Design an enzyme around this catalytic site. Structure first.
Site: not given
Ligand code: HEM
Ligand SMILES: CCCCCCCCCCCCCCCCCC(=O)OC[C@H](COP(=O)([O-])OCC(O)COP(=O)([O-])OC[C@@H](COC(=O)CCCCCCCCCCCCCCCCC)OC(=O)CCCCCCCCCCCCCCCCC)OC(=O)CCCCCCCCCCCCCCCCC
Ligand SMILES: CCCCCCCCCCCCCCCCCC(=O)OC[C@H](COP(=O)([O-])OCC(O)COP(=O)([O-])OC[C@@H](COC(=O)CCCCCCCCCCCCCCCCC)OC(=O)CCCCCCCCCCCCCCCCC)OC(=O)CCCCCCCCCCCCCCCCC
Ligand SMILES: CCCCCCCC/C=C\CCCCCCCC(=O)OC[C@H](COP(=O)(O)OCCN)OC(=O)CCCCCCC/C=C\CCCCCCCC
Ligand SMILES: CCCCCCCC/C=C\CCCCCCCC(=O)OC[C@H](COP(=O)(O)OCCN)OC(=O)CCCCCCC/C=C\CCCCCCCC
Ligand SMILES: CCCCCCCC/C=C\CCCCCCCC(=O)OC[C@H](COP(=O)(O)OCCN)OC(=O)CCCCCCC/C=C\CCCCCCCC
Ligand SMILES: CCCCCCCC/C=C\CCCCCCCC(=O)OC[C@H](COP(=O)(O)OCCN)OC(=O)CCCCCCC/C=C\CCCCCCCC
Ligand code: HEC
Ligand code: HEM
Ligand code: HEM
Ligand code: HEM
Ligand SMILES: CCCCCCO[C@@H]1O[C@H](CO)[C@@H](O)[C@H](O)[C@H]1O
Lengths: 74, 370, 241, 89, 49, 49, 365, 73, 96
Positions: B192, B196, B218-219, B262
């Site tokens: 935030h 994004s 959309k979500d 798995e």
């Molecule tokens: C329990 C795991 C995770 C949850 C609940 C989560 C959730 C989210 C949410 C809700 C957002 C904003 C929506 C989106 O762009 O998808 C986000 C963005 C992001 N997440 Fe995660 N995430 C998870 C795991 C990870 C992992 C494993 C990585 C990378 C090693 C990661 C990297 C990112 C990054 C860099 C963003 C920015 C995306 C953008 O704006 O281009 N996340 N994540």
């Protein structure tokens, strides 16, 4: 980050219609298909080859494996 | 009550052009809630004593009202969790989202914690895979010099996997998801600060739209598709992504001849299996995941996203095809020619990330004259 | 040997996505387990009550349970005793423990059959093939006494003698008890034993598909409605000059 | 009736002596919270159509609040106009 | 959909199938001396004879 | 059993007194103890349920 | 920072203000010892009691972790009651959000401790599970259904023990999240002080003044806890829970954990089912009414003699009810308990609001 | 709530000494005891009575209970 | 548990061997008896409480592992009970 404090913009006009005044699916198929085909063509040469390679390695390796498990007259 | 629910959701500014690849963040939130909800309900009937663990699970599936649907929803939900995790990470690599360093590194911690969590859950039903998975994975720690073995026995609560192990694993598996939830909230808070990224890799401050109603609807659409995929698995093929050997109670005297991990751990298992050295395989395994923390330092392109980078795209899909190759190899016996294909695929994996992609980045820069 | 023979795919009537189990076939399959397999194989997770409304009425199941004696107690003297079975009793175990089973079977262990179909790659295709696939050892293969050649068993040497053959039992409904028929019904029964939720998940799956066929395009319509404001918007740049 | 409704919501500008005490909720909120420099409701008529609404002038950070209160007031008149505010209009 | 889902979860908490499998109990009266309250465990609760 | 002011029963949890009929006589309990279905059979036996 | 280090605090808050941090410590202590006990505890009725004895006899230092958890629950209540008493006396309840969240916190901790006590499956565990869940049976039309649904059957049994382990496991973490919200609302106003007068003209930084004072308080809490654990681990417990659960027999002198005795005395004083349950619920929920019953022109009781006398009468009355809860339902305890129960509600609903008005009059406002 | 934005104060001077320049226990007993005694006395009439009442009700009820359990109370 | 408390490891070992405990199954699927060892819990005098009650005119000798913590008065109570049997007072007649 809040609307009102994002960045500076000058001289841009935007025209919009209420969703109740317009169709949700204008030219869905008539224009959607051509666009899907275009998008598909634009990316295929970047996406597909590696997977074709995988397919080749996959079929070759599997066959070579079976061949190695049989008829070894000695 | 209003604010931070709000200015943190309702009027949250979002890029006007984020695609479906941006839906996985909310889908991961949903997978987490699903696992937590089905998890708690299963925990209301599960007992962690080795004499009754396997039994309590069959009792859930046979006699608890709708116990079977909750169980298979939990099992298949773990699979959906990983599918989404891998799509989420892929999106990040392709679009250069990793430049949000804090968000990215927290994400790497999230991936590791979910892997550890899923590992421990799999041990709970105490079937054959449960037992040998507990044995092998905890033993990864034995590669640590001087104290490795001591650490393992301490984790096990004895000289081998037994009652003490199963009981503490139930406790660890129970609490970790809530810790994951707190870590994910931190994940979002850092995001935030910047808002994004988008498919173009170009700042979207000149064209933001409110999260509600555009991305809320959309979500929801994405959530429906996730539920369809989950329920197709639960209602039409609940065992498709599972292993028949776990329907056999744990037998400490015998490791199944075709034991395999798995599916979501197959690529990493293939990498470890390719190195005929204990410590070497463990390090390669650890590095196959931790290398994600290095991606930001390996970025050479003058552009953030791969959208306008043809060469980088080709290498990106080669990496995905390579992970697919390693996944396939992980499911095959350690025999010829799979041993060599896997070693090449393992080498190719690290070569693409550490050398080929950074190089493609520089070449593309030259071609654009900057 | 290390050579493997994988089972073919039989067209089970419960094979289809929306196809339920054949309950008359489950019923005959139970008779097979009871008459033939139960003397060596346990089925520790199925109780007589589980049969009710599946392949037997409540009274039939009660009568079935009463055909056996089960241990109960202690009584007021602190002693255990025998009594007729009841709906809440689990199917009787043929042996008190695995050691005893092995002792009664030349050292081999008949596994519990509650989950055999889910615990084996190929499921009922595998079990049907195994039961109906015993044959003479090929030339050059000699098995120790106690073992039987079966091309579908891993290594092809199994400690179980062919358990079924024509007329091994008589069905309550007069169905001709040919070996293949008996194999087909016991396998159907074993599928139900390993997955009693089988028919219900498919009925639910039908409802899920229908609901999705309705909700997905409607939510999609809601998505396009809201987004139309943006999808048809027009921009114009009018700098001073 | 539309003119009466518009008189209830009214007009306003930074030079009004009323301030916090103004009868119109929009004018009152606007003044105390400094939501705008000015606003005016209007009912522009043409032969068989017209524009019924309001115009306001404000700081870049007050647009959303102004819109929120303005629409809330239209909504309140639709569902809850009181006899006393109507007599005032 | 929500109604079905929610009710299935709620239902998982109600008595499971094994708990519902009840039966009758026979009690030998000659063992209960006059003046005595005998307690037996039945259908989950104490049964006084 | 045999406690309370009626030679019936006394519930130690909050002081409910019952008589030898199982009827509530004093305390906070609202009803007489439940009487289950039963039938006296051969011998000196009773089948409850 | 600014949520701790430079947090402005009144220069004069007393030791009565130390209980909030002590409650935080009791919560952390319960969570830490709790998790470690959960690493060796099994919730099947055939092995629950056994696993607990195994913890105390064979797990290295299992006995100290167990008795620290048991006595920690007692310290938790001592602190909770001191914390609430401070609030009533000083008028801290005028911070409405903070106060009402506090009431939720009290109920959740009570529910949490109830379920934990059931886990070892001793006699008190079993009958407590029976009685307390049955409180819901007072709900008309559906009460009995709710109870069987909670039990997972027609009586307390395996299904009950297993879900209670799960509920007891997660609830403390929920309590932790609710407590963080408790503090956030508090931070909007900052703390009240013994005078009940705004302290904005004399604020001092939380660090180092209250950080060191809280540490001193933490040391005293640990001393009290360890005096109990190392010198009298069973003093505040019940011998009957060293006897495995027996569904056919309720111990003749069964009594609740000491921190539930006052409420139990109140419920026992009413010879009617629904009436007793309503009085029980109200004896706790009345805390939510305190703010509406405030008549004094002054916030704290520091300058209010009459109110102070009635406040200590309430504390003495709760002490009376606690004693009565530990006595048999016989004369003259039945009547003393009824008077004490009536006095409790009378002091809160009538006498204190009235003393407030009289004091106002005496000050001419 | 942050220092700098709490409230308005004018014309107040505050003098302080470094903790290293002074005693931590000045007249601990010589002045502490008198103060404890004063505080104790100032509240006793408000705190003690209700507890004395408890004591009386406690001893009376307990005795009455025992007496009632015997042949000749 | 007695080792290093009131007996040496060998003394405790000898104590355990003074009794026979059930073990098994062996390779024939049968249970058998063997001398006790340090890991064995003290032998139970009855297989179940019903047999215990039967052997004691209906009364149940409680397990003694926690009897002192399970009774108000603890050892003061137990000592008093053990050394306090006496004749019934005049007017009191107990059932056999
Ligand atoms: C329990 C795991 C995770 C949850 C609940 C989560 C959730 C989210 C949410 C809700 C957002 C904003 C929506 C989106 O762009 O998808 C986000 C963005 C992001 N997440 Fe995660 N995430 C998870 C795991 C990870 C992992 C494993 C990585 C990378 C090693 C990661 C990297 C990112 C990054 C860099 C963003 C920015 C995306 C953008 O704006 O281009 N996340 N994540
Ligand atoms: C199962 C696998 C496991 C993963 C779990 C499932 C999660 C799915 C990911 C989330 C994506 C869901 C989502 O938000 O869908 C939006 C998206 C909505 O697209 P849209 O509203 O038509 O957008 C117009 C395009 O921007 C403009 O495109 P266009 O005008 O050229 O037309 C394209 C459109 C119409 O073209 C035609 O097909 C005709 O085709 C579709 O997108 C359908 O639907 C999909 O992309 C389908 C998801 C595929 C799965
Ligand atoms: C059972 C319940 C167990 C729950 C767990 C325990 C909770 C403990 C609550 C926290 C109390 C400790 C605390 O931080 O308050 C410091 C509290 C304040 O005393 P101070 O630092 O001397 O403050 C001087 C007074 O403000 C100025 O007053 P002063 O001049 O009259 O001197 C009073 C002082 C010195 O007077 C004399 O006794 C001489 O007497 C003492 O308090 C000692 O000291 C204690 O009560 C603990 C001292 C133990 C060493
Ligand atoms: C009871 C048992 C029911 C069993 C369930 C069976 C499941 C089968 C799935 C069927 C899915 C049907 C969903 C249809 C959604 C169509 C839709 O909304 O697309 C809108 C589409 C596109 O218009 P635009 O160009 O965007 O602009 C507006 C026009 N001026 O409009 C049309 O022209 C299509 C007309 C169809 C009207 C649909 C109205 C939606 C409400 C009702 C759905 C009812 C279905 C249940 C039937 C029970 C029998
Ligand atoms: C980990 C182990 C898992 C094993 C791997 C399983 C293999 C599954 C591969 C199938 C993936 C589906 C691919 C379909 C999408 C193809 C496509 O559309 O590509 C073209 C398209 C063009 O888009 P733009 O450049 O933005 O331009 C827009 C112009 N209108 O490219 C994209 O959509 C890029 C999005 C990539 C994200 C998803 C990547 C796939 C995920 C796999 C795992 C990733 C690796 C990380 C794991 C590390 C541990
Ligand atoms: C709930 C059931 C629990 C059962 C009750 C247990 C009974 C325990 C009672 C012992 C409490 C210790 C009392 C010692 C303190 C005495 C004392 O110093 O009082 C005088 C002193 C004078 O202070 P000021 O007016 O501010 O002026 C300062 C001038 N220098 O007053 C105080 O300290 C008031 C602080 C009171 C807070 C603690 C109250 C005791 C707690 C009991 C429970 C409270 C009720 C709420 C329960 C509802 C459910
Ligand atoms: C070893 C294991 C511990 C043994 C446990 C047994 C229990 C014994 C209780 C300890 C006795 C209490 C002493 C605590 C220390 C005293 C303290 O810190 O108070 C300081 C106080 C400050 O006075 P002010 O005039 O206000 O300021 C200074 C102006 N010039 O001074 C005093 O009252 C005492 C003066 C003598 C100094 C005492 C020593 C200070 C402590 C240092 C640690 C010593 C080593 C540890 C070994 C202990 C044996
Ligand atoms: C005892 C006389 C038997 C009878 C009757 C049947 N089975 Fe059996 N079976 C028996 C043994 C001792 C074994 C062990 C074989 C070994 O070498 O391990 C088996 C095994 C099976 C298996 C498991 C096969 C596997 O893949 O491991 C199956 C599926 C099986 N038996 C099925 C089965 C059925 C359905 C029967 C009734 C028709 C039946 N068996 C009878 C011993 C005996
Ligand atoms: C990140 C979230 C979670 C993941 C990824 C996860 C994953 C898993 C996996 C892979 C299994 C084995 C499934 C099988 O039987 O094949 C499992 C089992 C289990 N999980 Fe979880 N789990 C999660 C959250 C939870 C929570 C929060 C709880 C409980 C509060 C829980 C309780 C259980 C229980 C009781 C089992 C054993 C029963 C069973 O095997 O289905 N899980 N989990
Ligand atoms: C898990 C339980 C609880 C925790 C961890 C907790 C913690 C705290 C903390 C850290 C403080 C600040 C320090 C203090 O002034 O004591 C505080 C203040 C306060 N709490 Fe609690 N609390 C809990 C329960 C409650 C309860 C049950 C009530 C009352 C029903 C309550 C009412 C208040 C009020 C009114 C304040 C403001 C005190 C003042 O400034 O005078 N709290 N609490
Ligand atoms: C608000 C915090 C908590 C309170 C007030 C609390 C209270 C209790 C109580 C009163 C008992 C009965 C103790 C006894 O006499 O044996 C108990 C038992 C237990 N508690 Fe907690 N508990 C808390 C948190 C937790 C947590 C977080 C866990 C575990 C994740 C936990 C795990 C256990 C276990 C496994 C037992 C059974 C063994 C035993 O009886 O000591 N508790 N708890
Ligand atoms: C979405 C379709 C993916 C391919 C499904 C195959 O899935 C695989 O099936 C094997 C048995 O054949 C299992 O042993 C293995 O664990 C499982 O992952």
């Amino acid at each position: 980050r809040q609307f009102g404090h994002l960045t500076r913009v000058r001289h841009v006009i935007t025209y919009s219609l209420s969703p109740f005044e317009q169709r949700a699916f204008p030219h869905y198929f008539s224009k959607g298909i051509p666009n899907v085909l275009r998008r598909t063509r634009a990316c295929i040469l970047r996406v597909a080859p590696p997977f074709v390679a995988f397919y080749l390695v996959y079929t070759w390796g599997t066959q070579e494996f079976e061949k190695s498990k049989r008829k070894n007259p000695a | 009550l209003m604010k931070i629910v709000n200015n943190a959701f309702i009027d949250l500014p979002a890029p006007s052009n984020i695609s479906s690849w941006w839906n996985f963040g909310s889908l991961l939130g949903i997978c987490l809630i699903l696992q937590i909800l089905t998890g708690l309900f299963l925990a209301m009937h599960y007992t962690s004593d080795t004499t009754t663990a396997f039994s309590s699970v069959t009792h859930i599936c046979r006699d608890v009202n709708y116990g079977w649907i909750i169980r298979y929803m939990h099992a298949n939900g773990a699979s959906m969790f990983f599918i989404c995790l891998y799509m989420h990470v892929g999106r990040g690599l392709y679009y250069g989202s990793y430049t949000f360093l804090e968000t990215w590194n927290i994400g790497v911690i999230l991936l590791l914690t979910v892997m550890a969590t899923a590992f421990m859950g799999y041990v709970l039903p105490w079937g054959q895979m449960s037992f040998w998975g507990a044995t092998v994975i905890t033993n990864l720690l034995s590669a640590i010099p001087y104290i490795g073995t001591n650490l393992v026995e301490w984790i096990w609560g004895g000289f081998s996997v037994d009652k003490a192990t199963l009981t503490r694993f139930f406790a660890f598996h129970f609490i970790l998801p809530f810790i994951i939830m707190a870590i994910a909230m931190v994940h979002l808070l850092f995001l935030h600060e910047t808002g994004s990224n988008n498919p173009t890799g170009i700042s979207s401050d000149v064209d933001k739209i409110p999260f509600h109603p555009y991305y809320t609807i959309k979500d929801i659409l994405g959530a429906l598709l996730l539920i369809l995929a989950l329920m197709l698995l639960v209602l039409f093929a609940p065992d498709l992504l599972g292993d028949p050997d776990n329907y056999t109670p744990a037998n400490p005297l015998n490791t199944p001849p075709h034991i395999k991990p798995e599916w979501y751990f197959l690529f990493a298992y293939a990498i470890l299996r390719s190195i005929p050295n204990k410590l070497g395989g463990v390090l390669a395994l650890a590095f196959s995941i931790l290398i994600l923390a290095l991606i930001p330092l390996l970025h050479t392109s003058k552009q953030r996203s791969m959208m306008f980078r043809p060469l980088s795209q080709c290498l990106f899909w080669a990496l995905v095809a390579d992970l697919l190759t390693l996944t396939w190899i992980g499911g095959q016996p350690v025999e010829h020619p799979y041993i060599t294909i896997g070693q090449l695929a393992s080498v190719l994996y690290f070569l693409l990330i550490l050398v080929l992609m950074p190089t493609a980045g520089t070449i593309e820069n030259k071609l654009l004259k900057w | 040997s290390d050579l493997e023979l994988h089972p073919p795919s039989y067209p089970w009537s419960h094979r289809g996505l929306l196809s339920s189990l054949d309950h008359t076939s489950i019923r005959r399959g139970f008779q097979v387990y009871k008459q033939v397999c139960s003397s060596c194989h346990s089925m520790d997770y199925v109780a007589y009550r589980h049969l009710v409304g599946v392949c037997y009425t409540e009274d039939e199941a009660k009568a079935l349970a009463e055909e056996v004696e089960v241990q109960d107690g202690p009584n007021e003297d602190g002693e255990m005793f025998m009594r007729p079975g009841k709906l809440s009793d689990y199917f009787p175990k043929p042996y008190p423990n695995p050691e005893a089973a092995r002792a009664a079977n030349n050292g081999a262990l008949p596994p519990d059959l509650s989950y055999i179909v889910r615990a084996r790659h190929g499921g009922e295709d595998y079990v049907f093939s195994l039961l109906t696939g015993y044959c003479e050892p090929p030339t050059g293969v000699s098995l120790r006494e106690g073992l039987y050649f079966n091309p579908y068993f891993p290594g092809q040497a199994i400690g179980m003698a062919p358990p079924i053959y024509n007329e091994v039992l008589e069905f309550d409904d007069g169905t001709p008890a040919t070996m293949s028929q008996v194999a087909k019904d016991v396998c159907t029964f074993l599928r139900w034993a390993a997955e009693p939720e089988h028919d219900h998940r498919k009925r639910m799956g039908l409802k899920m598909l229908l609901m999705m066929g309705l909700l997905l395009p409607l939510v999609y319509a809601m998505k396009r409605h809201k987004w139309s404001v943006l999808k048809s918007r027009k921009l114009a740049y009018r700098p001073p000059k | 009736a539309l003119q009466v409704a518009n008189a209830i919501i009214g007009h306003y500008d930074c030079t009004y002596g009323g301030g916090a005490h103004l009868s119109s909720p929009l004018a009152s909120i606007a003044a105390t919270n400094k939501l705008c420099q000015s606003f005016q409701t209007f009912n522009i008529c043409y032969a068989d159509t017209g524009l019924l609404g309001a115009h306001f002038v404000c700081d870049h950070m007050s647009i959303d609040d102004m819109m929120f209160v303005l629409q809330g007031q239209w909504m309140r008149l639709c569902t809850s106009a009181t006899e006393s505010e109507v007599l005032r209009g | 959909a929500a109604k079905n889902v929610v009710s299935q979860f709620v239902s998982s908490m109600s008595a499971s199938a094994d708990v519902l499998a009840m039966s009758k109990i026979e009690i030998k009266l000659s063992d209960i001396p006059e003046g005595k309250n005998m307690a037996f465990k039945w259908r989950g609760k104490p049964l006084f004879v | 059993a045999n406690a309370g002011d009626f030679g019936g029963y006394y519930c130690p949890c909050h002081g409910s007194h019952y008589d030898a009929s199982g009827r509530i006589r004093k305390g906070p309990a609202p009803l007489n103890l439940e009487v289950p279905s039963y039938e006296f059979t051969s011998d000196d036996m009773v089948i409850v349920g």
